[PDB]
Amino acid sequence: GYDRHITIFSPEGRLYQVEYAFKATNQTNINSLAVRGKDCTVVISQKKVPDKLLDPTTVSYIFCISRTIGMVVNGPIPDARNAALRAKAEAAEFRYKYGYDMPCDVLAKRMANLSQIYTQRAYMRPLGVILTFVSVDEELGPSIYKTDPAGYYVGYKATATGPKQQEITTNLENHFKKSKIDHINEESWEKVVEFAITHMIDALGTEFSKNDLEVGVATKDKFFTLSAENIEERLVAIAEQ
Amino acid sequence: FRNNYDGDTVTFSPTGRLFQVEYALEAIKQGSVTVGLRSNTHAVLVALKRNADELSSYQKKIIKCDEHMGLSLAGLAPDARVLSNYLRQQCNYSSLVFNRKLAVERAGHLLCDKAQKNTQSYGGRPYGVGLLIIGYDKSGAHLLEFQPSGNVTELYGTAIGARSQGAKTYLERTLDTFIKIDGNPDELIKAGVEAISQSLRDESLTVDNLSIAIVGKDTPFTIYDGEAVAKYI
Amino acid sequence: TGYDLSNSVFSPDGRNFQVEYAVKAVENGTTSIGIKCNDGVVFAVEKLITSKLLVPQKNVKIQVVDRHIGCVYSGLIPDGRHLVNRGREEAASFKKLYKTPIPIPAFADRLGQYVQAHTLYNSVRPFGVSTIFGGVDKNGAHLYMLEPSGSYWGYKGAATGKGRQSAKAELEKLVDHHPEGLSAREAVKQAAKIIYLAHEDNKEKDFELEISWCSLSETNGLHKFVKGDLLQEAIDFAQKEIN
Amino acid sequence: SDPSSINGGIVVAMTGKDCVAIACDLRLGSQSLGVSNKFEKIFHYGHVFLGITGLATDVTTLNEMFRYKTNLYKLKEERAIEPETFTQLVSSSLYERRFGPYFVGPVVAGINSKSGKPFIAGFDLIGCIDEAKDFIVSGTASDQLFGMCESLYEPNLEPEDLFETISQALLNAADRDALSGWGAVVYIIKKDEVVKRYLKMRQD
Amino acid sequence: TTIVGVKFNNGVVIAADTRSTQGPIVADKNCAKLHRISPKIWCAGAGTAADTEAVTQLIGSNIELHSLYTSREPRVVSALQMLKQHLFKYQGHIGAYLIVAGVDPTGSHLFSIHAHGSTDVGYYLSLGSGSLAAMAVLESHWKQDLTKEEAIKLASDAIQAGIWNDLGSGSNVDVCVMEIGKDAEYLRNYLTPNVREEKQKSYKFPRGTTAVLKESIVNICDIQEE
Amino acid sequence: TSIMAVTFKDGVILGADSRTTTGAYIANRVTDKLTRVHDKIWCCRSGSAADTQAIADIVQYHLELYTSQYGTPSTETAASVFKELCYENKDNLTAGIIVAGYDDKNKGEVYTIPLGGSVHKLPYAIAGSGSTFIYGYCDKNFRENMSKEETVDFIKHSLSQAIKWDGSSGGVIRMVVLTAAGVERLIFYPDEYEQL
Amino acid sequence: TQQPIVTGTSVISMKYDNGVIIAADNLGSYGSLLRFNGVERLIPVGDNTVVGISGDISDMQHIERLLKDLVTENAYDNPLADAEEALEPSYIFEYLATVMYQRRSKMNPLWNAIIVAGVQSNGDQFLRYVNLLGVTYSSPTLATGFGAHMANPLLRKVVDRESDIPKTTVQVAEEAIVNAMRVLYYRDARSSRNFSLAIIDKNTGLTFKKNLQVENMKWDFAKDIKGYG
Amino acid sequence: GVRPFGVSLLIAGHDEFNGFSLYQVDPSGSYFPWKATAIGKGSVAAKTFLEKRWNDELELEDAIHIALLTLKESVEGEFNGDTIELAIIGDENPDLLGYTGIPTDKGPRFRKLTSQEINDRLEAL
Fold first, then answer.
1. F1 carries an active-site annotation
2. Interface with E, mutate which of F31, F34, F55, F94 (most E CBs under 10 A)
3. In what order do the strands lie in the sheet with A41-45?
4. Does the keyword Nucleus belong to this entry (chain H)?
5. Which residues of chain C neighbour F81 with C-beta distances below 8 Å?
6. CA neighbor of F148 nearest in space, from F174, F170, F122, F180
7. d(CA D169, CA D188)
8. Which residue out of F1, F20, F31, F75 is catalytically annotated?
9. DSSP SS3 for B89
10. How far does the CA of residue C118 sit from the closest CA of chain B (Å)?
11. Mutual orientation of helices G57-75 and C77-98 as an angle, nearest 10°?
12. Cα–Cα distance between D16 and D158 in angstroms, integer?
């Protein structure tokens, strides 16, 4: 239908185009996880291990946008890259404009506004990726802001994304009620990573190797990716179950 | 497949072959026949000068582009024009700024590109005209074919337009003979006449219709007609 | 569907129908391979000889870029040649400004954004070539391949065109024999055999083998075509074992 | 001679009790040649009064300019022009030519219609917003006028007293100026009505 | 023009004189020089008067825009940055030179900004033409970690040295104390040297001293529909 | 105004004074001019403070983008981006910028960008008012791959003579030590080195 | 409008029978202050050309970078090229001249005086001059600035005309350049003791002799005089 | 080629000249003042309730209790002050002026009422 194609309001008044973007962002099947520790923000994504024709390490879904701010991407790769530019770019420009490091909350707001402009542009087809910013924010400390392809955005205590998102959510919900707070337990940055690794394994039911994950960790003034072998230190106690 | 997909340059068939491209080729088949060939030291183009009627003058289809350059057309007349003036422009820029004559090969890469821009674009015309370009640079004689696709190919000898069958066969046979022949303008020019007779249904052999161009390491780009082509006819 | 009759509409597929078609065209191009070695890369390509009237090694498919980036491409010849030319212009700006040769992943990114825009818009027809590129920059040797999708990744082997299937199988030996990659001189010989067995799938026309390399130990980390005696020798190795 | 002082002219305003006054002389000269004995330069937009000193062609220009802008104000917002908003409006325009400023001295006088609050404000070439409520002076002979206004004026003047005070201030400066001397007009502006008085004074 | 800035422990205090001059004539007896970029970012302006008000108004809006956009009180440095670029473009013809002060969630700051585009940080700064006079007190008495109370004396006394030596410094001293976690305490007319004094003699004129040649009554009032 | 950088074995040490005068008046005696453009590429500013300050912010943001997309800038890369803006605008903007930064592979690198605007790698670099005064003293005393403590001392020895000869040089000798350790501040009062 | 800030100095050069010789000392002066005492002013492009650039160092690097790109541009399209349409001293030369005059027309030149020396594909010797206003000439002997007046006259004693070119051997030419540079060090202050030498010979390619020193300083006349005393 | 704003507003506000004021702005770009209006699914329900219980001449304090009840028809599963955002534009707050010591500047007219504050207003219903 022509009704499917028009960028301008659909007869329903809720776009077909928007529902479509939502389809897209589950083609790759990346289950990702982001939680807020006490003073640490853990992001984990499946690192696929393809054939030898590609290097496995190089393949990634976790990207360092700026200092403190990391981004996990869910949905197709070429569109991921397109989006990525604009966010890296603005963090720099804000620092020039305003002479201080950009806060997390403000970067997400900018990108919702760009998303909406896309459906007002006739030529342009709306980007069909999930941008979830994680950081140790300047004021607010651990912060999670998940951004939708449509352009809806909302903050999170914890979240997962994927087609199998549903299973992970339940564990995280019940956990937080027993713990009676919103932060994953232990001040220590190291053991919170391990509580995240473990909870990913449970929900999905599949044990993942160091090969099958990538672990990005937020501290004060850096976002950085751990070594392959760091992951293993956690994994080993857990792996016998 | 009129309209729908493959009806505009942007829209793909599922396979991804533009039907329009083949049509642009058809324009060349409808086009005036021309046979081009070379040797290391000379490049010789022979083209039949088409005419409407007796009183209409036999019209040149070989166009001198530059002193050391020239081209011949087979296909759509408006397109050839926009392209030809551009050939001239580029050659002038290099001579002025960078000293050098524009090399024949390197001019072709640009020409390719120009054709592809119209294929990227909404609207515009992919050029629907094929051009045999001959030239004398510091790499000596060359002969290119420019396709409506864009592709430029260095060939010993080729022919485009109407009934290409007879001259192509003829060239394959005499391939070895004209490539060894160098240092002989007059003999290359003979080979080329003999070649165009095969293609034609003997429409004319008149001095009046055949126009022969030659550029090489010896002769500059000179257009030969009447008496000068009566030697070899 | 009407998504094939209007570019850059979000399909319920999630990828526009036209862009998909564009990929398919890569296959109609020639077996082109690339081999990542231990101190450089090799590019190798099957160039079908159309006729006796074609002229040896003059319309070579291998194209030089920068002075350290070796480039070859499969699919629409016109589309790719413009893309390679676009690529130099980008590299050019990079050199003036930052006074330094482009890193190979920098080069991939820049090209990546260019493709992306030209598919996200109705106005500009999707690109329909896959490009094998890389060489020896500052961070040493890399082999990358750029999908017309606009994904790119690092690789240790690349193979594309029709006869990629043959090619991938022969590339698996390389990794097992050496995680490093094979020695750059010895890999010239392996590369010829790969192109030649994959010309048994594209035998219907004649072919010419064209190899190039950018290798720190045998090229000083500048780009060069392998020609002459190394090239003629390579053909023999291949001919001998497929007998 | 800078373009403002070719044409000079003077404006002097004072607040009184539940009233303001805005007053000027009527001499228009260009250099040695005096051009018209009678010439006005105090205009009113609603109950808000603006006299304007300085270069005559720029006076005319700005008067049109403001008449244009203030029309829109009363139509769109569906309320009379106040002095408070009007002070900002004069200021905004003046600043847009920073480089090569309008060669004028505008003076606002009017009463806020929401509390009877007497309001005067002044301006120079460059858009300064002067908040003196005692008095405001402007022109070439501004300096002279200030000196009158500072001795004669007293806080709290009855309307009929304020009328005498301002008149003597305007008059004596006039005769110690070159580019003034010919006639005078005083606007005494009250919330209920305006009385406008052409005085009798010495003439060259 | 004498303007001071003094950091104290739990905030900062900015002060400047109210007296305004246009040439050697006193334009305004009082008119405060302390302008509001935002509720807890105040600055006091020196230079060309017109430019100082205008730039504060134009920039003001963008800062206000920022605040609401971000749902967060902008940084003191954010105002600093935005201010600096504006001036820099015109290479200082726009001649606003300002002491930028404020408190924010990050902490307390005191900077100076010049029209050319140069910045500094100071514990204690002075600006205007009376910078020379005010500083001298400051440098002779200031110690590390002055109390709020002590900052306020040192500060006011310093403005007095400006007053008496610089002609353009004068009348009431106005002070705005911005403290962490609290609404700025604008201390209007902290200091008063002396004020206008009534003239010895009366300058009341009996009515009929002014002569009235003609009269025309204007009706700005609404003519009847009838 | 006197600024300097001197290479040594283990990296480079950036030094500056901090006294900036407007006319005869000392406008600020504790002026900061070691400005971080990158984690271990810092710059030293002299000339017009207004102009160098603007320049340094523009470069800064540029190197952040370069880090994210193209990978980490080296000291050379930075020197070019400083150069290009300085060159086209050689006349409008006055700039004496020393771009120095520390790679573990190449130890300390020092590149001086004069007013004219050109890249010149030097084992050591001097600029500002005070450099004329010490030009020969430093050449006499230059020593390549010296100890880290000797490097501290040298900066101190040379600058004390700059203060004597130039009364606009002076205030705290601040330092940014770039070695692989990280980034370390040293601060040395006048009181120490002037009497030394 | 570009005005000189950082400065350069004289370049001497000559034709001989089988090639050409260009030489220049290695200085990047900032006026009276000899700030940089080893900034190499001879920039080879391939073995084919060595382009001597005097005047501002800032613009020496601007052009240096243009040439770096120009090599790459040439190598794009028909890369089996190596001596055909591949760069010649004349190719290079023509490019610089055209840019230069356009820069002068915007009343803001690149402020340099330049001598292109090199050997054509024919083997013919090339020496052609171009400078900031855009004065173009070729001459058997060429020198700039201070060199023009002082090291040019000695060169002419040898290669007085066209016919003298063949008689001048690469050996005489070598003595000639080297001797001349000593004189310039003696009586010009700018000139340093260090100098570089480049020989483009059709047979031996590029022989680039760096960091040669001027010796045999004259103080034999210094000791004779004591003036008034 | 640019679709209408997907949203219709109420702009409620306070200014001096024309006192408290209440508006609707339509994505068409027509606007109208009202005595009372409500929008959304439950617009039918709400408007009639306001009519019955209230008129402008009644004080504000009564309306807040009324408005909660009205919205409470809409949904009864949760009405907790977390999920309900309630604000007033009314009197100035000279505290929230934020640069006290100057009184003449109007404080903020708007004051957003916290969840706790809502809960207080729920026990007054």
1. yes
2. F31
3. A159-161, A32-36, A41-45, A214-219, A222-225
4. yes
5. 97-98
6. F180
7. 15
8. F1
9. helix
10. 9
11. 160
12. 7
Query: Which range marks the domain in which residue D119 is found?
Result: 1-204
Cα(C187)–Cα(B178) distance, rounded to whole angstroms?
A: 41
| Domain around A9 | 1-241
Instruction: List chain A gaps (C–N > 2.5 A) by preceding residue.
Output: none
In this complex, do H2 and A119 lie within 8 Å of one another by their Cβ atoms?
Answer: no
With H, G, I as helix, E, B as strand and everything else as coil, classify residue D89: helix
Which distant-in-sequence residues (6+ apart) come within 8 Å of D68 by Cβ? none
Chains meeting D at 3+ CB pairs closer than 8 A? E, H
Structure tokens at A219: 């501290």
The answer to whether the CB of F187 falls within 8 A of the CB of F175 is yes
User: What is the extent of the structural domain holding C161?
Assistant: 1-243
What do you get for the CA distance between the two ends of chain E, in Å? 60
Interface probe for G, chosen from F81, F84, F118, F122 (most Cβ of G below 10 Å), is F118
Q: Are E166 and E2 in contact (CB under 8 A)?
A: yes
User: Which residue in the set C53, C58, C79 is minimally distant from B157, CB to CB?
Assistant: C53
Deposited resolution, Å:
7.7
Instruction: Give yes or no for a contact between C3 and C11, defined as CB atoms under 8 angstroms apart.
Output: yes
Q: Which chains touch G (3 or more CB pairs under 8 A)?
A: B, C, F
Q: Among 3.60.20.10, 3.40.50.720, 3.30.559.10, 3.40.50.300, what is the CATH number of E1-222? A: 3.60.20.10
CA–CA distance, D150 with D156 (Å, rounded to integer): 14
C-beta of residue G126 within 8 angstroms of C-beta of residue G20? yes
Distance CA G88, CA B100 (A): 9
Instruction: Judge contact between B167 and B119, C-beta under 8 A.
Output: no
Residues 6+ apart with CB under 8 A from H20: H13, H14, H89, H90
Token pair for H47: 């408007």
Q: For residue H98, give how far its alpha carbon lies from the nearest alpha carbon of chain E (Å).
A: 5
CATH, residue C134: 3.60.20.10
Q: Which residues of D touch H18 (CB under 8 A)?
A: 79
Amino acid letter, residue E162: G
> What residues does each domain of chain B span?
3-233
Reference D98, options E21, E83, E98, E96; nearest CA is E96
Strand ranges in F150-190 using DSSP code E only, listed in sequence order: 173-179, 182-188
Domain count, chain D: 1
Instruction: Report how far residue F79's alpha carbon sits from residue C222's, in angstroms, rounded to the nearest whole number.
Output: 25
Contact E132 F25 (CB under 8 A): yes
Nearest CA in chain E to A94: E78
| 3-class secondary-structure state, position E175 | strand
Residues in B lying within 8 Å of C, measured between beta carbons: 4-5, 9-16, 109, 112-113, 115-117, 119-122, 149-158, 171-172, 175
Report chain D residues whose CB lies below 8 A from the CB of E87: none
Contacts with H2 from chain A: Cβ below 8 Å: 8, 120
Domains (range + CATH), chain G:
1-229 (3.60.20.10)
Among F80, F109, F121, most C C-beta atoms within 10 A, so best to mutate, is F80
Q: Can you tell me the distance from the alpha carbon of B24 to that of B80, in angstroms, rounded to the nearest whole number?
A: 13
Q: Does A225 touch chain F (CB under 8 A)?
A: no
Choosing among 3.40.50.1970, 3.30.1050.10, 3.60.20.10, 3.40.50.450, the CATH entry for B3-233 is 3.60.20.10
- Cα separation of A138 and F60, whole Å? 21
**Cα–Cα distance between A154 and E25 in angstroms, integer?**
60
Interface contact flag, E183 H102, Cβ < 8 Å = no
CATH superfamily, with its number, for domain F1-196:
Aminohydrolase, N-terminal nucleophile (Ntn) domain (3.60.20.10)
CATH of the domain at A233: 3.60.20.10
